[PDB]
Design an enzyme around this catalytic site. Structure first.
Site, PDB file in Angstrom:
ATOM      1  CD1 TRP A   1     111.710  31.733  71.038  1.00 17.09           C
ATOM      2  CD2 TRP A   1     113.604  32.722  72.040  1.00 17.09           C
ATOM      3  NE1 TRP A   1     112.012  31.267  72.462  1.00 17.09           N
ATOM      4  CE2 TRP A   1     113.095  31.814  72.749  1.00 17.09           C
ATOM      5  CE3 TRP A   1     114.726  33.431  72.306  1.00 17.09           C
ATOM      6  CZ2 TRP A   1     113.858  31.499  73.984  1.00 17.09           C
ATOM      7  CZ3 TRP A   1     115.176  33.453  73.240  1.00 17.09           C
ATOM      8  CH2 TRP A   1     114.791  32.531  74.371  1.00 17.09           C
TER       9      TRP A   1
ATOM     10  CG  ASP B   1     104.294  33.891  73.464  1.00 17.68           C
ATOM     11  OD1 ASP B   1     104.816  33.428  74.468  1.00 17.68           O
ATOM     12  OD2 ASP B   1     103.226  34.706  73.408  1.00 17.68           O
TER      13      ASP B   1
ATOM     14  CD  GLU C   1     105.323  37.542  70.107  1.00 15.87           C
ATOM     15  OE1 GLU C   1     106.248  37.375  69.883  1.00 15.87           O
ATOM     16  OE2 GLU C   1     104.776  37.289  71.481  1.00 15.87           O
TER      17      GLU C   1
ATOM     18  NE  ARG D   1     108.716  35.362  73.696  1.00 17.65           N
ATOM     19  CZ  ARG D   1     107.850  35.901  72.962  1.00 17.65           C
ATOM     20  NH1 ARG D   1     107.768  35.878  71.745  1.00 17.65           N
ATOM     21  NH2 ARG D   1     106.819  36.416  73.547  1.00 17.65           N
ATOM     22  CB  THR D   2     112.557  37.929  79.365  1.00 14.72           C
ATOM     23  OG1 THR D   2     112.089  39.118  78.414  1.00 14.72           O
ATOM     24  CG2 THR D   2     113.234  38.665  80.435  1.00 14.72           C
TER      25      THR D   2
ATOM     26  CG  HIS E   1     111.249  44.153  76.260  1.00 14.55           C
ATOM     27  ND1 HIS E   1     110.197  44.031  75.147  1.00 14.55           N
ATOM     28  CD2 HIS E   1     111.923  45.171  76.069  1.00 14.55           C
ATOM     29  CE1 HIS E   1     110.452  45.071  74.375  1.00 14.55           C
ATOM     30  NE2 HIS E   1     111.201  45.840  74.742  1.00 14.55           N
ATOM     31  CB  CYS E   2     109.761  38.033  75.510  1.00 14.16           C
ATOM     32  SG  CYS E   2     109.509  37.889  77.049  1.00 14.16           S
TER      33      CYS E   2
END
EC number: 3.1.3.48
Length: 283
Positions: free
Chosen positions: A169, A171, A105, A224-225, A217-218
């Protein structure tokens, strides 16, 4: 009727959906922070930030407390937001920054996700250097790389913040209960060690409950957060008897109704709660 069966989970969903729908932002919704004068505030116009727990007037970021657990949850800062971001990071005497956005990302230039913690750089009055230090297997092929961010600014005292980056990881996915328990532990211990350092130095930030809070934070700061946050909340003994229903309503009420985004992420929280004999529903 198992307190963790289809029926009970059917009720938990019923409740949480009603809540999510109620929290949906309205145009110039007074419950949510609004962009001032042109500069974009929000990364996704529908993922908003509760005004009441806003950390900064120009960032999508919230002070969150579930039970007795204090943290900051935020969106991946936009380019124009980086200097304020580091400012928040420093004033908070951040015991630990946990980034959950993947390298792919970050790598992808269409996502506008500046690679702010793996390279050195200058941002207005603040300059920053990064330093990789360790890499830890969490399980399942999931890997956490760690860095130390030194934030300097003239006339300010220099602050170091340890970073934990889970680079793989994806999304909209949920890592297993085990990797999740393993990452929560890794974040608590990192926070602990840095806190203890402030404490041995007599930092005044040690008194202040608006400071020394882990920052997580993602990309959007709600999927995820939220999953990781619910996990930290569960491995803090002082949150004894807090249910999954409360856990999620406090996150939703203090940031936005999307917190704990995908259904599979809620299943991970429910497995841990079950392994603990922690109640799903209130009453």
């Amino acid at each position: 009727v198992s307190p963790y069966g289809p029926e009970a989970r059917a009720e938990l969903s019923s409740r949480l959906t009603t809540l999510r729908n109620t929290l949906a932002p309205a145009t110039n919704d007074p419950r949510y922070l609004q962009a001032c004068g042109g500069e974009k505030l929000n990364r996704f116009r529908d993922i908003q930030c509760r005004r009441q727990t806003a950390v900064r007037a120009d960032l999508n970021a919230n002070y969150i407390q579930v039970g007795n657990t204090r943290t900051i949850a935020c969106q991946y800062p936009l380019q124009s937001q980086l200097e304020s971001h580091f400012r928040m990071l420093a004033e908070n005497r951040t015991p630990v920054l946990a980034v959950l956005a993947s390298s792919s990302e970050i790598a992808n230039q269409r996502f506008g996700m500046p690679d702010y913690f793996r390279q050195s750089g200058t941002y207005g009055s603040i300059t920053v250097e990064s330093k990789m230090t360790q890499q830890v297997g969490l399980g399942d092929g999931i890997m956490a790389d760690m860095y130390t961010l030194t934030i300097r600014e003239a006339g300010q005292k220099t602050i170091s913040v340890p970073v934990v980056h889970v680079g793989n990881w994806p999304d909209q996915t949920a890592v297993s209960s085990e990797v999740t328990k393993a990452l929560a532990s890794l974040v608590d211990q990192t926070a602990e060690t840095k806190r203890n350092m402030y404490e041995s130095k007599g930092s005044s930030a040690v008194a202040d409950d608006s400071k020394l809070r882990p920052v997580i934070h993602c990309r959007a700061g709600v999927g995820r957060t939220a999953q990781l946050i619910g996990a930290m909340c569960m491995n803090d003994s002082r949150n004894s008897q807090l249910s999954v229903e409360d856990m999620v309503s406090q996150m939703r009420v203090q940031r936005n109704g999307i917190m704990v985004q995908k259904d599979e992420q809620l299943d991970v929280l429910i497995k841990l709660a079950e392994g603990q004999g922690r109640p799903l529903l209130n009453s």
